[PDB]
Scaffold this active site. Structure first.
Site, PDB file in Angstrom:
ATOM      1  N   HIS A   1       0.799  -1.225   0.000  1.00  0.00           N
ATOM      2  CA  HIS A   1       0.000   0.000   0.000  1.00  0.00           C
ATOM      3  C   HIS A   1       0.837   1.282   0.000  1.00  0.00           C
ATOM      4  CE1 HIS A   1      -3.585  -2.459   0.630  1.00  0.00           C
ATOM      5  NE2 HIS A   1      -2.843  -3.148   1.478  1.00  0.00           N
TER       6      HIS A   1
ATOM      7  N   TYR B   1       0.811 -15.679  14.198  1.00  0.00           N
ATOM      8  CA  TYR B   1       2.151 -15.118  14.098  1.00  0.00           C
ATOM      9  C   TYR B   1       3.218 -16.192  14.421  1.00  0.00           C
ATOM     10  CZ  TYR B   1       6.247 -12.286  14.412  1.00  0.00           C
ATOM     11  OH  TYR B   1       7.496 -11.771  14.202  1.00  0.00           O
TER      12      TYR B   1
ATOM     13  N   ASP C   1       1.973  -7.141  -3.495  1.00  0.00           N
ATOM     14  CA  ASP C   1       1.360  -7.901  -2.415  1.00  0.00           C
ATOM     15  C   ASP C   1       2.067  -9.258  -2.396  1.00  0.00           C
ATOM     16  OD1 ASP C   1      -0.233  -9.534  -0.779  1.00  0.00           O
ATOM     17  OD2 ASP C   1      -2.117  -8.772  -1.609  1.00  0.00           O
TER      18      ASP C   1
END
Lengths: 248, 248, 248, 248
Positions: free
Chosen positions: D39, D157, D62
């Site tokens: 982004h 994670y 991405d």
């Protein structure tokens, strides 16, 4: 079923705290135990009276002395005929003193008891296993995850624990490569509730344990039952941690 | 015995190989088992016939599918009233090839079944345990020696097993931090003899095992009894390796 | 160049093999190097001759002897006036025997040189850095892959490198907790080509190295340049493995 | 005398924070860099402007997208002619969501970005290195020690970090077995001071760092310079941690 039926086990540091919990689990599962201690001979009297002198025996032993190992082996065979299991549980703890101020003697003593004594025990147990147990047996090297509260800053204690861990690997492999069915594994207790400590530490201790409390001695005993029995015939050169998630 | 008296265990991939071994040990110790499989429906019927309708149930399950998890929970509670233990044992090998030639879809299937499926199962088991078992329970992720060291022939497999090992740490801690007495632990089998293979391949496999022979399914079963029972109440977020010295 | 500009380093075992490689990289990058040996004056002379007289200094040293650390330190401050870096590279293999037949004196000698010597050097260096470098510096413990995974042929070597490894962690944390900017890290070399060795042994060593060849001594020096310079100011208590994928 | 002279490197998430630090070190050392971001296109243009478009290029990407990987490879070769290094730096941090409340879609997102993306990048980079750099290159998989402040409690994670560790080992090995000189290693940043944060958050963060302060982006870049250059030719399948002793 008694998971340690007729097994003969030597448990060092076996009359107090963690070693005692291991002895209790062992006797419960039908094992014969030789529990030892350097200074706590009355601890030995109490354990034998608890277990019964048909299934237990105390021997005085300084694990750092090559000579006391032969003495324990001979006493074990004389009493029980054989050796099937060695639990190397005796060890001295960690202190928080600055590394650059640590005297060689204080370092050397920790290495002697926490590391070298493991080597000596292995060597003694292996000979007795080859001699009396058809070269079959199980050796358990016990070392606490943390032996001091907070950061593992004790270079001697940490070093000897790291040494013990690799010793276990190398010894399991050294044996396996010559076809000898003697397994060597390590157990890693987190914080067990035995010795009382100042509340600014005890609270600070529990704060480091995710599950919010300390273990009992039989928590370590239960894993040792597993490792001592033939339930664990394929577990070898491995590390078994019981620490309430301490190093997760 | 009855080391698992009145525990209800879900065992994924529990109708053949290692999973069947875990189920056999579980039933021996008084547990009620729900064994699952994706394709092997006949293996599942055979398992229930051998264990008995009163203590075992087969549910068909694709572990990668979120709805199949809800399906097994539903069937388990309807059959046995509660969920005490989840053993995430279902898994799949993966495509043996050059890493840069691996298709994304083949990578993804392996991640889906060996890793994401474990997360889906933990989540589903945790909710069932809070609802039916007073928020107490034991979750065992059967990973692999390949989650500890790299497996050259199958990196997706290695990746998925290294992931489920760390998933185990995080999950245990995530639960423990909030006072929830659900333990999460990982088991890392080495080579276990579960299928017929060429003698050339068998020799290659055995060369990598210091003790010179593959393990048996009940070797994994035994450590799973310890982890599923209250004996291991202080074992959490830890790794239990049964591999005859393979990664020592 | 000049990555180690105006830094003074002591490198034990610095005149042959890995250590000479480290010294060669260090000199190349602008360091003053005090290289030591216990029994290689001939080696120490060639090094001094090739590095120059103003950039390198040779001292005889037994790293197991507490008195020789003082001697080396004193002579380093005599010649270059400060100590910024210590590379614990001196180390010895042991007997390649069966574990139960290893003599305690052989065990002890490996532990003295590979483990206890590292602790002695750390003390020495920390004291010298506190006074002559504003309590800033870098200590590099050169263990080995044998300190990460077991070496069947040498359990004492494994135990000692396992010890060196945890010593590193502990020492780094001991200093940091007291706000002292002395970093400690370990480096773990795999098989580096130093000796001449027979082809049979060569072939079978190279069999265990995924990349198909041994490393060079300067391979270890490059990672030590990094660890010695301020490029690594945030690298602390960590392990740095350069082994051609040996324990991957 | 520039350490990455003539090298071409792709650096994902390379336009801010840690990635930008790696890019800065790389350009300083003579490398050409392609930095990417999903982004943050404004940051991408800024970085190229800062470095100069004769030594740098920005591509929107991405990293979870197979097609974007081809896009980046295509643009890199179009502009710089070859690919010598890949730094997989893109990534999502963790959250403190309860495991049993985590949605599959949120789980999947992190797996896609923090694990599967590394696989896709490795795949793309290896093809490009074979085609344009004579099957020589270096791949670096960056993943931070902690994804959250306290205990590592984020299952997604932790799982993806665990998987990337093993993907790194297995990929290095997969390649080495085919005599392909592409090295794969992982880098583990501790807390790096990259953004404005509240002082109570900073306090909690520093509490977990033994040296008592965060690192700087170029701390990560320096170790990446080492890994990306030929100074580390024998470094493979290994993990390099730069964390101020955070997990010591």
């Amino acid at each position: 079923t008694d998971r340690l039926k007729d097994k003969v086990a030597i448990i060092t540091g076996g009359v107090a705290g963690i070693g005692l919990g291991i002895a209790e689990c062992y006797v419960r599962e039908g094992a014969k135990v030789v529990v030892t201690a350097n200074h706590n001979v009355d601890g030995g009297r109490a354990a034998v009276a608890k277990f019964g002198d048909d299934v237990s025996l105390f021997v005085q032993q300084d694990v750092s002395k090559e000579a006391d190992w032969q003495k324990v082996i001979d006493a074990t065979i004389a009493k029980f005929g054989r050796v099937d299991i060695l639990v190397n549980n005796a060890g001295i703890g960690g202190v928080n003193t600055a590394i650059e101020d640590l005297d060689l003697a204080d370092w050397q003593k920790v290495i002697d008891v926490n590391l070298t004594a493991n080597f000596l025990g292995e060597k003694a147990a292996i000979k007795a296993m080859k001699q009396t147990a058809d070269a079959k047996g199980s050796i358990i090297n016990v070392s606490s995850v943390a032996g001091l509260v907070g950061l593992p800053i004790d270079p001697a204690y940490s070093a000897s624990k790291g040494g013990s861990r690799l010793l276990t690997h190398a010894t399991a492999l050294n044996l396996a490569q010559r076809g000898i069915d003697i397994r060597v594994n390590s157990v890693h207790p987190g914080w067990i509730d035995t010795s009382i400590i100042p509340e600014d530490l005890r609270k600070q201790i529990i704060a480091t344990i995710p599950v919010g409390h300390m273990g009992q001695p039989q928590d370590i005993g239960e894993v040792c039952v597993y490792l001592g029995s033939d339930e664990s015939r394929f577990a070898n050169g491995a590390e078994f941690t019981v620490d309430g998630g301490q190093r997760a």
